[PDB]
Structures are given as C-alpha cells and as structure tokens.
Amino acid sequence: MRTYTFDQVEKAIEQLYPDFTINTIEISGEGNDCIAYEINRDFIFKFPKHSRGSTNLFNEVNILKRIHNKLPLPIPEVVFTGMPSETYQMSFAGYTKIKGVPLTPLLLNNLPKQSQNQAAKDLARFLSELHSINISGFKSNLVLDFREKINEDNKKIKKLLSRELKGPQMKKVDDFYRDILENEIYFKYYPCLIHNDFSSDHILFDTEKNTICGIIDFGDAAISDPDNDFISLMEDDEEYGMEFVSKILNHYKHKDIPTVLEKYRMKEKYWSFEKIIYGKEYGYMDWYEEGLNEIR
Numbered sequence: 001m002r003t004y005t006f007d008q009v010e011k012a013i014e015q016l017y018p019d020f021t022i023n024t025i026e027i028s029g030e031g032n033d034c035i036a037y038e039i040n041r042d043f044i045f046k047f048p049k050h051s052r053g054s055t056n057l058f059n060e061v062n063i064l065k066r067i068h069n070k071l072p073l074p075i076p077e078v079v080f081t082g083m084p085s086e087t088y089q090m091s092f093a094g095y096t097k098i099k100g101v102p103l104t105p106l107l108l109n110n111l112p113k114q115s116q117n118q119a120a121k122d123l124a125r126f127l128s129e130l131h132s133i134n135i136s137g138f139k140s141n142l143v144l145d146f147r148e149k150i151n152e153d154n155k156k157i158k159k160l161l162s163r164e165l166k167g168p169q170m171k172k173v174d175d176f177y178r179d180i181l182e183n184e185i186y187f188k189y190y191p192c193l194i195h196n197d198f199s200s201d202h203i204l205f206d207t208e209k210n211t212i213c214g215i216i217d218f219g220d221a222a223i224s225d226p227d228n229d230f231i232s233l234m235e236d237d238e239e240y241g242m243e244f245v246s247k248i249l250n251h252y253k254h255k256d257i258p259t260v261l262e263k264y265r266m267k268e269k270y271w272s273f274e275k276i277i278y279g280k281e282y283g284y285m286d287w288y289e290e291g292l293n294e295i296r
Ligand SMILES: Nc1nc2c(ncn2[C@@H]2O[C@H](CO)[C@@H](O)[C@H]2O)c(=O)[nH]1
Pocket: 028, 029, 030, 031, 034, 035, 036, 044, 076, 096, 097, 098, 099, 100, 101, 201, 202, 204, 216, 217
C-alpha cells in the first residue's frame, strides 16, 4: 500500500500528456492493485498501490491492447500510459470511462426475468468469445498452469507456516495438498485466455436498457482454465449463485457441468490457503491471520 494525492496524479499525467488539461479529479473505485481516479468525469486513471499491482496494471494494458476488438461487450480502451521505473512496470494507465453500475446480485435479482435471462446469455457469449480468442501471439509468461501453481502453493505454505503450525497440523495441510494433486480433474483443461477475476463487481450494467454494458478489471487475465470464469460467479454470498450460473453454462454449451461444480467446491475449501499466500504476497496481514486461524 502506497498513496496518492491529486497533485501527484495531475503532475504525473502532465509530465507525459502536457496538452491534456485536467479539470476535475475524484476517486472512481479501488481494487487490490490500483486506485482508480475519475478525471474530467470521462476518464479513469489507475495508479498502482505497490510494485505487484503495477505489474498487474502492465499485464492489463497489454492484454486490453490485444483483445480490444474481439469481444461482444465493451471493455476498457487504453488511451493514456505511464512509464516504467525501478519500482513500477507501469506508473499509471488511463482509459475511457464505461458508464454504468456493477451488476450486483441484488440488482440482478430485482430485474424482470426476461432481463435476468438476457444477462446470463450476454455473459456466456462474452466468455465463449473470450475463451475462443486465439492465444498464439500471447506472451507465454501469461500461461498459468494450475498444477504448477498448487505445487508451488504447497511449498510456500510450508515455508510460511513451518514455525506457526504444530507438526500434526502441518501434516494435515500436507495431506490436503496431496489429495488435491492426485485428482486429475483440477489439472486437465485446455488452456485459453480467461478474465480470471470474473465476478459481479467487474460487470457493468446499464439500468435504462437493463443490459450489461461493460466488463472491466483485466489485471488478473491469464491463459489458464476457462472454468475459472464460472466458479468466480458461483458464490451465494457475494456473487450470483448456482441457478444463475447454470443458465450461463447452458448458453455457453458447457459439456461437463459436474466438473465445474467440483472445482468450485475445491476452490471454496482452498480459500483459507489463498488468504495466507495472497495475504503475504499482497501484504494484507488481516487476511493472513484469518486464514491461519481457520487452518486451526
Ligand atoms: N463505472 C466505472 N467504474 C470503473 C471503471 N473502471 C474502473 N472502475 C471502478 O474502479 C474499480 C477499480 O478498477 C473498478 O472495480 C470499478 O469500481 C469504469 O470504466 N466505469
């Protein structure tokens, strides 16, 4: 976590875009990587909160450039870019603002049923088109192999928690990982481009038309398991629930729905472990203690 004032934001952008006069600045929203500023009412400028976030911002800028006209929904179009330094791979990025509000579970459920169903179809067509984008020209570094990630997570957890857990407790963590890794269904998928953070906060809605009008926040985008993009929608608390996602799956012509459900169940048990690792790697200490407490 690092912080910006309006004066730094304006100065940073002026250095590189001297001819863009700034009138108004205000915070649009915040994710885990960047703060997003609304400039001149019509632009969103993301500035990274730390080096990791900046690397994700850099990722987002390059992916958006590659897929800019391949999708059936608006996505952010980059119009302004910052520069690298010893600290940030990209100091900021500016794009055209997508008007609209997040499609919260609450909003979605209050829509007429025909609109709920168009939303499901629209989300599926967007995912289908996305997961079909040809990935040849993509940076091979973008590939996230789930088997590799799980193995590396198991060594990170050991190394992080070795002096925190009693032996029997670490042995059970070890068992959990071993069990995950002997199940081939988590690891057999055809890699493609995925949004990888495809949740309701990132789906923008036009409440005059009652239709989805944008997908945002491509900072986690990767070449990986397409099923990631359904499981992130399935949580009942903060997301859409099984019923709605099962309409999406059906429009998508998903062939193996029980496999999607099993990946969701495993991801849900996996969350404590993600909180420890994501906690340390994004320096969110609250998450770390929560997952550690849970593990006991
Ligand atoms: N309404 C709107 N919000 C955005 C846009 N880009 C970023 N944000 C907000 O800022 C947060 C961090 O990117 C997002 O998750 C949204 O809350 C945009 O184009 N339109």
